[PDB]
Amino acid sequence: GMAIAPQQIQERLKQEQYQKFVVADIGNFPHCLAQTPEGIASGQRYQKYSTNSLSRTPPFSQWGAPQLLTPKSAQEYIKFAQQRNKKSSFKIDGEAVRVSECSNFAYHSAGVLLDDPQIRTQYDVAVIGSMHSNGRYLHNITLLVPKGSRLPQPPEQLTAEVFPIGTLIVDPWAVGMGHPPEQALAIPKEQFAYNRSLFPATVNYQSALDESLTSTRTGQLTPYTGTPS
């Protein structure tokens, strides 16, 4: 039968409620913040988080101010999603606090996607540094590439002419920043909120090159919410 469709992948990512995260660097990127109810809410949520004493306790302290992190195995991405979805006593507006930012948020979605068995047989997963600025890549993004694809490896850059047909972009930070799923969660580049800063990019992880992938269990994650009927 048919493989898993973009719509079902997007629905799986919607279950994570990425718009509800505390986006710890929201104040650094006003130009990336959508004027939507979600964007307004995210701005206010960060205000409440930032000066709450619990934001300066682990792991919140570390989630809000990350050291360079470059996961190189599928299981690390799955664990990243699992750890960020743990609910602790720290709540804002009655909602358990989860925290991420422009660099590492994409790792959560890489874990969600790597944990799905029907994604495994239809797409390879990659994680790229994007939003290039003065030799730095400010923003990591997750990609779904059709099976068979090999993206350039550093120091070669990823550009449009080596971006495979059928690639889907996954950017949970964009959703934290108020953009809708249709601009961020498993969509083509023409639909992507930050499509003028997508290229050039650097490819930091390719599941197609990860020898540990096959022994990485699927179904490890519980979706953060269940889709409403």
Residue numbers in the entry: 0 to 228
What did the original publication write about this model?
Among all bacterial pathogens, Legionella pneumophila maintains the largest known set of translocated substrates, delivering over 300 proteins to the host cell via its Type IVB, Icm/Dot translocation system. In at least nine instances, this regulation is direct—a hallmark of an emerging class of proteins called metaeffectors, or “effectors of effectors”. Through detailed structural and functional analysis, we show that metaeffector activity derives from a diverse range of mechanisms, shapes evolution, and can be used to reveal important aspects of each cognate effector's function. After release into the host cell, translocated bacterial substrates (effectors) regulate one another through several different functional interactions: indirectly, through counteracting modification of a shared host target, or directly through either steric complex formation or direct modification of one effector by another.
